[PDB]
Predict the structure of endothiapepsin.
Amino acid sequence: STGSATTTPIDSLDDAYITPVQIGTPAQTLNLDFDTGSSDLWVFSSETTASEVDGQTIYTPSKSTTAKLLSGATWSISYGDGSSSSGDVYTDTVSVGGLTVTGQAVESAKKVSSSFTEDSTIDGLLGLAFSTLNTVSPTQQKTFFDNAKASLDSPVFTADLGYHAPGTYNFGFIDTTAYTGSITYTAVSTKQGFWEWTSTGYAVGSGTFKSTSIDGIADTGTTLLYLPATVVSAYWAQVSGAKSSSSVGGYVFPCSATLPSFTFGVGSARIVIPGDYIDFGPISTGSSSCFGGIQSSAGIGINIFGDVALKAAFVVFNGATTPTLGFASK
Ligand SMILES: CC[C@H](C)[C@H](NC(=O)[C@H](C)NC(=O)[C@@H](CCSC)NC[C@@H](N)Cc1ccccc1)C(=O)O
């Protein structure tokens, strides 16, 4: 079996991507943010504090005939964002682009942080990291990918995010039509439960490639690209007027400047991120200062290859017995 769904940016800056998901019977369609950095499938619902919902589409378990409450089960999640959500759990049928999974854990939100309430275009999240990260207790739950694995033609899923355009999420197969050249696979570490890999180095613009090991995680749930201070400094030094602002909390640059591309290494292969992808617009409406798409990870504790880097390639998440990450140009 297979599945394929279209993913769309929530705004003109590609802050996040939403993908339609069918939950329950009859089907209740909600637009979820596919997160390969988390392992929980939560959605705004009829249980969510009325004051905490502002325009989102909610899931009403009572209206689904396949919905069943998982007695005593609760959940609580926190994001690197400072974001948080919690509530109860139900089991229901979930379908993504034609691929159906029965008995999937659907975490119903009773409480949602302000950040979420503010985002009217996101109805919930669908975690695609490893199940060891699930926050359901006392009994931990498996992710949607984990539940489909068995039925997939291949235990894989691909990420093809678009730049200021719609993209695709495929389950069970590799569209050899979506990329150019060959796919370069790299080893993945599951120790921390993330799609953790090691990049072989980087290059700034037409500059010489620097061979250095960069351990980070492929996270579709993160907007930007977070790298070590040394690397980030080398990139920004090439942009006239660019500088780190303590008030803004990151590197900013004159909106009129032209950004150089950024190259990251994958084995002997190289993925080039056009400078256009790094521009995050005016820090504030009307401002002549723009926010950079490449920031330091000094305060995060881990390097993150977010949407900024991921959208520049065709990404294969091989969930085989020995997980691997595949990268290809497109
Ligand atoms: C960063 C530290 C937090 C607290 C950590 N949580 C995590 O690692 C969770 C699973 N994953 C995440 O926080 C991140 C992974 C990067 S750091 C590990 N997943 C992407 C994420 N931004 C989800 C999101 C999407 C839209 C809006 C907001 C947030 C924890 O449990 O300790």
